[PDB]
From a paper:
We stabilized the structure of the branch junction, corresponding to an ADP-Pi intermediate state of the Arp2/3 complex, by including 2 mM BeSO4 and 10 mM NaF in the buffer during daughter filament formation. A second structure at 3.2 Å resolution has the phosphate analog BeFx bound with ADP in the active sites of Arp3 and ATP bound to Arp2. We reconstructed the branch junction with ADP-BeFx from ~200,000 particles in 8500 cryo-electron micrographs. The map of Arp3 has clear density corresponding to BeFx in the ATP γ-phosphate position. Compared with the ADP reference structure, the branch junction with ADP-BeFx has a 2° rotation of the outer domain of Arp3 places subdomain 2 (SD2) 0.8 Å closer to the mother filament and buries more surface area between Arp3 and actin subunits in both the mother and daughter filaments. The net bending between subunits M2-M5 is ~1.5° in the ADP-BeFx branch compared with ~2.1° in the ADP branch. Overtwisting is less pronounced (0.6°) in the ADP-BeFx branch compared with 0.9° in the ADP branch. Arp3 buries slightly more surface area (1524 Å2) on daughter filament subunit D1 with ADP-BeFx bound to both Arp3 and actin D1 than with bound ADP (1415 Å2). With ADP-BeFx a hydrogen-bonding network stabilizes the D1—Arp3 interface that is lost due to twisting of Arp3 without phosphate.
Arp2/3 complex is composed of seven protein subunits and nucleates the formation of actin filament branches on the sides of preexisting “mother” actin filaments. Elongation of these branched actin filament networks powers eukaryotic cell and organelle movements. Like actin, Arp2/3 complex is an ATPase. ATP hydrolysis and release of the γ-phosphate from Arp2 and/or Arp3 regulate the turnover and mechanical stability of branched filament networks.
Numbering used by the authors:
A (entry chain O), F (entry chain Q): 6 to 375
B (entry chain F): 1 to 168
C (entry chain D): 1 to 219, 221 to 317
D (entry chain A): 2 to 39, 66 to 427
E (entry chain G): 2 to 152
Write the structure that this text describes.
């Protein structure tokens, strides 16, 4: 067995290769206390990690060590990996290879320090660093398609044909569920309700995860919510009081299809997918159009597969069929795909091994993992 | 490939599937030991008659059989000295891996290019209809594998000729 | 490597050490080379003085083709009495050594270049005589065929430079022709050698490499070498002929061309060995795909979950 | 038989030493490393080896080491390493020369078979001898090749970059039932020096810097709990080492208790492995006591050291004193039961001028002997029996 | 040394093929006469074009024994010659009408013809092998594996 | 049964003597992956050949090893013969004597090397190298006629009378269906469709096959198409985009009649045929005009028989019959003619046999073949 540790920017998703689904899913958060620690003894800790922080958050400054899929704070990222292996999986990491992941078009130094900490702190016996939108394509049961992965921090497209990636046609967009959370705070502020702190940012994430949905036709949905009760509904806070919301429920997800709302100049996710298909060689485009693959938690909004199929069918030539593949387990497909990969018998030849790291130094990942 | 070997490989497939009716058998000459009786030959009543199947003076199979073991040995096409070297070496890689192709011998019987030993334990713990499909799919493809290697040898003979000759 | 070095690497590295060294140690080093050649490098009188010496079975022939004047031109003051058991010897003094790091570099190169400087003498005799015939032919183009006909039989060089070879060469007013009477005695190299020599001739007949010498091949000898000693047609030799035209040994090219034509048979000998190293890496690729044709005979069972060292494990 | 100087190749896990028999040093000593890539196919021509393949890590080649724990274990890489050794560096013709190759005592028969088929079918060499490497290293001890200077009885302790093994030899015969082997040597102590620099988080811990800190700074102390205590009392023992990075800039490394705790891997191999628990002085006593009784005075009297990883400052004296302690304690138990005295046994551990490459100098000195062409596998025997001609162990007792 | 001296061959006499298969009752000259009368009927059946009645009559008796190679080879020469002279579209009409005893005499001798390609054309024997096994089933090879070794 | 291959400069046609049409017809192509394989488990393969390379082409750089009827990359031609033998016909090359086919006025080195490969690499028992135009008279059932063969790589005339060829009157022209694809790619740019890659070349080859024709008078057809949409057609790319095509529909094949379009100085196929007949002896011209035989795929354009009859009738003397026999099977008529020749009772003595080759070397071919 080998660990598969998809340290995403919003959730760590971890477990064992060939296991059905990730067994350690928790916030990619380190919390530190912000108040007068008056009661002596009491089992107090200098910092808290994951669900241990999320449940204590009313006294903590929660901060994610990872932003837009790039590690910003290594002293806390080691704290998350240590929590993953010793507290959440309860293994010794020196006994198991780890398949890690990262998004494409990351800094070189991210990939180096992430191999160095696995070999020099966690003492791991072998490791590998897969591209997240390649893994999501194993989890679809395919060898050609265009994975749209979108998580908490990054959205990216990787077009693949016959198992060859077309790396010139990879699109990264630094917009995903954390920007939709920050935008939901900016529009909730307009109805009556103020959310400000790093802990209140989790309450509005827990709104976004169950009140929001994607409108199939935003400009007509906007007129319908401005003229009826049916689109409005309510959520009950930790403080027992009720929050009622309406056109905020679909204006939030719409930022993915209209990044101009949060001040970005870019294509939306629909036109970013088409700009990746139209960068590919002309003979493969039909087999990409019939195999768009949704992945990552930001693709979980009710109606996003219907909307994505509508917007791509308007951009694509009407002569040919579009399919969006969106399984119900697309919430974890990058982990699911790493759990396939780390169990394929040729894969056991591809690991960076401890001995090979010791001899080659941390630059070995650049001449073995892609 | 297939269409020229089709008469021959239907004779080999049919002989080899009629030959692979193996059983557990404790040896009569030694106590508390089983042995592959085709390979030892010390008690004759549990050997079956050795059958040859054959397309040509070059291309032949010898099939030897016993109550718990079958030995199968083949000569493949070697029509010039480049195929003699390419075959003789290719089979030494293929028998050098015998610990992981469980049915291979590590040495051929005398005057054969490669040889297989399908023992009772293999027909209990491996799919015996996929064993003959591997023997047959090896005999179809090995002529295409070796002929392709004599193309790559010509390709390098050109690589070194052009690279030497183009720096005058 | 794709093509052989012209110099002996060991003598280049060794002299590059001692020419840099603040404190030389003593040495006694016999050093083999291709074509049955052998060097001896030693410090016989002092650690300060290096004697380099060369042994080569055909050196008595090379002295007939003017070798000593070429070696006295190149090595000058460093030439020494031949060491007993060796054909030629040079004594270089590490305290009397040239001044600059680029003088040291080109002297360490020049001394390591000894095999191709001793075996160059018949080529310089042919190139410099073709320069005379090129002027005589330019004086009378109707006499020129008869000057070529007599130089083809009177000015011919033959060097029995190893026992399974002969290099034969002669000047004519527009060329130097050189013929390798070449044989591979090791039978697995004779089998590949047919492919390597055939594809070498067939390569010259393509648009990409027309700028090269006209190569030709046979197995009987070219008409103008059919009565040279040691050339025999029946003994399974092959007769690779290069025609070097005036454009293949123009003054900028002569030294590279001499260096590069001597090494001919040695590149084929090296590439025959280095083709077995290729065929093996291509064979063990097809073995690794026949593995898949057997793997479909193993019944599907999950082998139990284990730690990296193969010890048993208890999770999932 | 050909008369040409036999070619000698000690392919170590760390360094290959190459040359011709009868020379006074190896023609080359360079790392056993190959640099490889990681419309005609040429990725098997583009490789480099030795000192010229360290220069290639920045040019985007992957370096790999085809010998690990003293055994060849990548045969594609080792075949390319030999072709390039023979045709670039040694610049020889294999069909003219006998070759002496070396391997550890406990190598698998499969590796001698693969070595023989590569030498006879790829290179076509005239003949081959595959020498057990520590059996040669005794012959580097002699003051000269001449018969009166020989001392054909002695234990030989060999420790390179990848294996240490102790071979007893007596009256010129290798006592094969008594060989001891431990795959812990110069590289495993480098990974330990590297592991310590890395736990202190020093500016550089690349393999080349731990390899240099071993041979610059480390030594074998008497006892590590007193040496840790000395590093508190005696603060000039924390050396400062200046290392230059892969990318061409300065650094400074403080070197600490790895100055003694790293060579201690030989005298307490529990530090390195769970599997090889027996320390080198007791591993030597197990050799000499397993050996037949009449040779034991001779085997202790002459314990030859060999191979680069025996060169640590004070290594010979630690081995001599800890072995003398094991030996005189055992003799004094026997004096106790008898009440009579004994003459004891002298234990000498012999460090000597050729200790850095003793296996090569041993191979060179043996291969000069007129009999050597008769001990080789000649290619005539290869054409008769095939590569199985090399499969039999010369050293151990064989059934059949 | 002693380890290599075999004793089993001189203290534990093993079975012989004539213990496992009953010995032939007909004498060598009695079968050599019986074959030499049939081969002319088979040679004649080719010369009159009725080669299929040649096989039916040739296959009515079979020579066997370690004493008779010089006439087992003549019987095999006539049999391979008769197989090389039957039209491939007539084979399925012959094979479906053979008894299981005659079939087990055909396929037994085609595996003797396939053992000597430098004297017999394999291409027509492999064609008979496909047709005889496809029509009469795989057990007809198993009766050859199990058959007498001096056939 | 003998084999027969027409190793075409753009399609291989291969089969057995006595069949009515080729057993296998496939592009004379070899392709290598241009991208990096990211999937494991996929059957990654270092080169594809024939129809598999044509099918996977969106990730391959495609090479033709034959240029103008001359083999120029031998390694990728040996791959194609190994594909014809072991994969397409799936018969071992040692079992069957084999008729190869070649264009007139080729390099001697091309036919020697093609002999040396067949006897020393494919070990064939016998072979023969017939001239492609001489086989077109066998297919057409003639013994007197002038062939006009035109393939992918080359166009040539061989005039023949009572079976005697006139080798002084052979005209050969390195302009055929490849140079028409290269020119159609160029003029397609003038309407705005940029095709650039070795795979887009195979889309523009298909446009040329599906839509082009030869217009009976070019200045009249130009003045027609300049006024009107009636001559236009539309083709759906494998991308589902539709291109629409104008006077470049017939300005492409006119290159055969006006080589100055592609800059080269030569007579068009009409004048080069008339010059071949005017080089012939005066008594035979009167029959060469009556038995003018077309072959090869570049002679398949609609209206090319009527264009060719109109132009030869304008050149040749008006007092006698011009009669062009372009049969409906003419796409394969070199192979069909080869399958007749190799089937003749009188041809079985004319093969170069292996025992007869190795006593003479490959220079035997020039003293048994034409
Ligand atoms: N049901 C849902 N509806 C909308 N957003 C969701 C839903 N489920 C998860 N998300 C969002 O997905 C993000 C986490 O997705 P994930 O794929 O695990 O990201 P990452 O890999 O970067 O950690 C968070 O922003 C989370 O709120
Ligand atoms: N002075 C020294 N002190 C300690 N180790 C040394 C010294 N000099 C060299 N070494 C070590 O010796 C080893 C190489 O020895 P060698 O005999 O060549 O081993 P091998 O044969 O296995 O390659 C390396 O670990 C090297 O760092
Ligand atoms: N129906 C057609 N209409 C026009 N061009 C055609 C047609 N069919 C094939 N071609 C062209 O003819 C060429 C193939 O003809 P072919 O006779 O097989 O040539 P070759 O023998 O040299 O390979 C290609 O350029 C192809 O595009
Ligand atoms: F980091 Be998550 F994939 F956005
Ligand atoms: F490989 Be070294 F001899 F330890
Ligand atoms: F062979 Be194609 F006719 F050029
Ligand atoms: Mg993610
Ligand atoms: Mg060593
Ligand atoms: Mg053609």
């Amino acid at each position: 067995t080998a660990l598969v540790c998809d340290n995403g920017s919003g959730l760590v998703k971890a477990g064992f290769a060939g296991d059905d689904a990730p067994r350690a899913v928790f916030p990619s958060i380190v919390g530190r206390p912000r108040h007068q620690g008056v009661m002596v003894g009491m089992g107090q800790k200098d910092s808290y990690v994951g669900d241990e922080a999320q449940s204590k958050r009313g006294i903590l400054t929660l901060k994610y060590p990872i932003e837009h899929g790039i590690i910003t704070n290594w002293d806390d990222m080691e704290k998350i990996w240590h929590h993953t292996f010793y507290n959440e999986l309860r293994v010794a990491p020196e006994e198991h290879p780890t398949l890690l992941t990262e998004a494409p078009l990351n800094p070189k130094a991210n990939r180096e320090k992430m191999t160095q900490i696995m070999f020099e702190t966690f003492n791991v016996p072998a490791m590998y660093v897969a591209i997240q939108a390649v893994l999501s394509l194993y989890a679809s049961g395919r060898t050609t398609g265009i994975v749209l992965d979108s998580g908490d921090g990054v959205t990216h497209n990787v077009p693949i044909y016959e198992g060859y990636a077309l790396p010139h046609a990879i699109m990264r967009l630094d917009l995903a569920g954390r920007d939709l959370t920050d935008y939901l705070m900016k529009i909730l502020t307009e109805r009556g309700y103020s959310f400000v702190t790093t802990a209140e940012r989790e309450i509005v994430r827990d709104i976004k995860e169950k009140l929001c949905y994607v409108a199939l036709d935003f400009e007509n949905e906007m007129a319908t919510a401005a003229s009826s009760s049916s689109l409005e509904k309510s959520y009950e806070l930790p403080d027992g009081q009720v929050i009622t919301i309406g056109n905020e429920r679909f204006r939030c997800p719409e930022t993915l299809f209209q990044p101009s709302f949060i001040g970005m100049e870019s294509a939306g996710i629909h036109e970013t997918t088409y700009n990746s298909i139209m960068k590919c060689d002309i003979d493969i485009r039909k087999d990409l159009y019939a195999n768009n693959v949704m992945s990552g938690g930001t693709t979980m909004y009710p109606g996003i597969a219907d909307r994505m199929q509508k917007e791509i069918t308007a951009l694509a030539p009407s002569t040919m069929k579009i399919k969006i593949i969106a399984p119900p387990e697309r919430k974890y497909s990058v982990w699911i795909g790493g759990s396939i990969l780390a169990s394929l018998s040729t894969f056991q030849q591809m690991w960076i091994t401890k001995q090979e790291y010791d001899e080659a130094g941390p630059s070995i990942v650049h001449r073995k993992c892609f | 490939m297939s269409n020229t070997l089709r008469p021959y490989l239907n004779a080999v497939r049919s002989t080899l599937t009629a030959s692979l009716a193996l059983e557990e058998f404790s040896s009569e000459i030694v106590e508390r030991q089983s042995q592959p009786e085709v390979e030892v030959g010390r008690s004759p009543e549990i050997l079956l008659k050795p059958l040859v199947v054959s397309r040509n003076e070059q291309e032949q199979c010898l099939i030897e059989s016993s109550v718990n073991s079958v030995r199968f040995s083949i000569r493949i096409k070697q029509v010039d000295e480049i195929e003699r070297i390419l075959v003789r070496k290719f089979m030494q890689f293929l028998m050098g891996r015998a610990e992981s192709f469980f049915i291979l011998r590590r040495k051929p019987v005398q005057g054969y290019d490669i040889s297989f030993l399908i023992t009772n334990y293999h027909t209990e713990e491996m799919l015996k209809h996929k064993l003959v499909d591997f023997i047959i799919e090896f005999m179809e493809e090995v002529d295409a594998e070796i002929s392709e290697m004599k193309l790559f040898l010509n390709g390098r003979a050109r690589l070194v000729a052009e690279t030497y000759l183009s720096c005058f | 490597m794709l093509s052989l070095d012209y110099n002996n690497i060991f003598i280049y590295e060794l002299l590059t050490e001692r020419f840099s060294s603040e404190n030389p140690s003593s040495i006694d080093q016999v050093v083999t080379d291709f074509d049955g050649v052998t060097f001896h490098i030693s410090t016989p009188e002092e650690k300060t003085k290096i004697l380099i010496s060369l042994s080569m079975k055909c050196y008595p022939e090379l002295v007939n083709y003017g070798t000593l004047d070429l070696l006295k031109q190149i090595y000058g003051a460093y030439v020494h009495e031949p060491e007993m058991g060796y054909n030629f010897s040079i004594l270089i003094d590490l305290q009397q050594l040239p001044a600059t790091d680029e003088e040291k570099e080109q002297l360490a190169m020049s001394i390591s270049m000894l095999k191709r400087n001793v075996l160059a003498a018949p080529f310089h005799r042919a190139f410099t005589k073709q320069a005379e015939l090129a002027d005589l032919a330019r004086k009378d183009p109707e006499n020129a065929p008869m000057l070529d006909k007599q130089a083809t039989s009177q000015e011919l060089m033959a060097i029995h430079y190893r026992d399974e070879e002969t290099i034969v060469l002669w000047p004519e007013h527009d060329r130097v022709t050189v013929v390798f009477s070449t044989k591979f005695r090791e039978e697995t190299d004779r089998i590949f050698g047919k492919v390597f020599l055939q594809e070498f001739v067939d390569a010259r007949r393509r648009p990409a490499i027309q700028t090269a010498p006209q190569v030709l091949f046979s197995y009987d000898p070219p008409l103008e070498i059919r009565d040279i000693q040691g050339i025999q047609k029946g003994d399974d030799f092959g007769f690779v002929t290069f025609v070097l035209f005036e454009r293949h040994f123009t003054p900028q090219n002569r030294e590279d061309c001499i260096s590069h034509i001597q090494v001919f048979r040695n590149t084929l000998h090296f590439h025959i060995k280095a083709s077995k190293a290729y065929m093996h890496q291509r064979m063990r690729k097809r073995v690794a795909d026949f593995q898949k044709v057997l793997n479909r005979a193993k019944p599907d069972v999950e082998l139990e979950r284990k730690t990296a060292t193969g010890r048993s494990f208890v999770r999932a | 038989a050909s008369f040409n100087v036999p070619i000698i190749m000690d392919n170590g896990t760390g360094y290959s030493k190459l040359g011709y028999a009868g020379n006074d040093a190896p023609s080359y000593v360079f790392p056993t490393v190959i640099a490889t890539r990681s419309k005609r196919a040429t990725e098997d021509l583009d490789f480099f080896i030795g000192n010229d393949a360290l220069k290639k890590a920045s040019a985007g080649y992957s370096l790999d080491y085809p010998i690990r724990h003293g055994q060849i274990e990548n045969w594609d890489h080792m075949e390319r390493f030999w072709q390039q050794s023979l045709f670039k560096y040694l610049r020889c013709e294999p069909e003219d020369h006998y070759f002496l190759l070396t391997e550890p005592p406990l190598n698998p028969p499969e590796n001698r078979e693969n070595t023989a088929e590569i030498m006879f079918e790829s290179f076509n060499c005239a003949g081959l001898y595959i020498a057990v490497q520590a059996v040669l290293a005794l012959a580097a001890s002699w003051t000269s090749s001449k018969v009166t200077d020989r001392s054909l009885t002695g234990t030989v302790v060999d420790s390179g970059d990848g294996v240490t093994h102790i071979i007893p030899v007596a009256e010129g015969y290798v006592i094969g039932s008594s060989i001891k082997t431990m795959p812990l040597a110069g590289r495993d102590v480098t990974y330990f020096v590297q592991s310590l620099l890395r736990d202190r988080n020093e500016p550089d811990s690349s393999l080349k810097t731990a390899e240099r800190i071993k041979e610059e700074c480390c030594y074998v102390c008497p006892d590590i709990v007193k040496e840790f205590s000395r590093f508190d009392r005696e603060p000039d023992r924390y050396l400062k080492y200046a290392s230059e990075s892969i990318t061409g800039h300065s650094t400074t490394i403080d070197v600490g208790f790895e100055r003694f705790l790293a060579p201690e891997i030989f005298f307490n191999p529990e530090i390195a492995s769970s599997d090889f628990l027996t320390p080198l002085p007791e591993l030597v006593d197990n050799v000499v006591q397993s050996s037949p009784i009449d040779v034991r005075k001779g085997l202790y009297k002459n314990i030859v050291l060999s191979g680069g990883s025996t060169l640590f400052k004070n290594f010979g004296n630690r081995l001599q004193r800890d072995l003398k302690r094991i030996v005189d304690e055992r003799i004094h138990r026997s004096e106790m039961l008898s009440g009579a005295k004994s003459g004891g046994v002298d234990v000498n551990v012999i460090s000597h001028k050729r200790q850095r490459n003793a296996v090569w100098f041993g191979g060179s000195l043996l291969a000069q002997t007129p009999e050597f062409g008769s001990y080789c596998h000649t290619k005539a025997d290869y054409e008769e029996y095939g590569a199985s001609i090399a499969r039999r162990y010369q050293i151990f007792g064989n059934s059949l | 040394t002693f380890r290599t001296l075999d004793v089993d061959s001189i203290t534990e006499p093993v079975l012989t093929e004539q213990d496992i298969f009953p010995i032939r009752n007909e004498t060598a000259e009695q079968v050599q006469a019986a074959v030499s009368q049939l081969i002319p009927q088979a040679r004649s059946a080719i010369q009159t074009g009725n080669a299929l009645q040649g096989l039916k009559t040739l296959l009515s008796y079979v020579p066997y024994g370690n004493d008779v190679q010089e006439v087992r080879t003549q019987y095999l020469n006539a049999f391979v010659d008769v197989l090389s002279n039957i039209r491939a579209a007539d084979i399925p009409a012959f094979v479906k009408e053979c008894s299981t005893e005659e079939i087990d005499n055909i396929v037994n001798f085609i595996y003797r013809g396939l053992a000597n390609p430098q004297a017999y054309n394999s291409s027509v024997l492999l064609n008979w092998h496909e047709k005889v096994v496809e029509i009469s089933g795989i057990g007809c090879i198993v009766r050859v594996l199990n058959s007498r070794p001096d056939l």
